[PDB]
Amino acid sequence: MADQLTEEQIAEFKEAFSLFDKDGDGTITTKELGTVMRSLGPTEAELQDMINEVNGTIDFPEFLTMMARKMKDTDSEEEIREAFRVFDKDGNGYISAAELRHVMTNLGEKLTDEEVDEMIREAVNYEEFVQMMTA
Numbered sequence: 064m065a066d067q068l069t070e071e072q073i074a075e076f077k078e079a080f081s082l083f084d085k086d087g088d089g090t091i092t093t094k095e096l097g098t099v100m101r102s103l104g105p106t107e108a109e110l111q112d113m114i115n116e117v118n119g120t121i122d123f124p125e126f127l128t129m130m131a132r133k134m135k136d137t138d139s140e141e142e143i144r145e146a147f148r149v150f151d152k153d154g155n156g157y158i159s160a161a162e163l164r165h166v167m168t169n170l171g172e173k174l175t176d177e178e179v180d181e182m183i184r185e186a187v188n189y190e191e192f193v194q195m196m197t198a
Contacts, residue, residue, distance in 0.1 A: 077123070079102065089123070093117075100130070
C-alpha cells in the first residue's frame with residue numbers, strides 16, 4: 064500500500080519531481096529517473112526494476128510506488144529500533160521472560176493466554192523476538 068510513508072516524504076518527493084524537469088507535465092526518462100532517485104537519496108538493479116515497472120516515461124505515481132518500498136522498510140526499521148530502545152530502563156537490549164510475557168499478555172492487542180504461552184515457547188533480545196514473531 065501507499066499509506067506506509069509519511070506526508071513530509073511525499074511532499075519532498077513531489078517537490079523534487081516538480082523541480083527536476085520543466086513545469087506542467089513533469090515526465091522523466093529512465094536516466095532522469097535514476098538521477099532523481101540519486102538526488103533524493105544507488106544500484107543498477109533497482110533502476111532496472113523501476114524501469115521495468117514503468118516510451119521510457121515515468122510519471123508521479125510510478126515514481127512514488129517505486130520509491131515507497133525502501134522508504135517504508137527504513138521507516139519500519141527505525142520505528143522498531145526506537146520502540147525497542149524505549150520502555151527498558153536498562154537499555155542493554157535484553158529483557159526477562161516474565162516481563163516480556165506480561166507485556167505480551169496485558170498489552171498489545173487481543174491475544175489469549177495459550178497463544179502467548181505458545182509464542183513464548185517458540186521463541187531475550189527484543190529485535191530477535193520481533194524477527195522470530197514476524198517470521
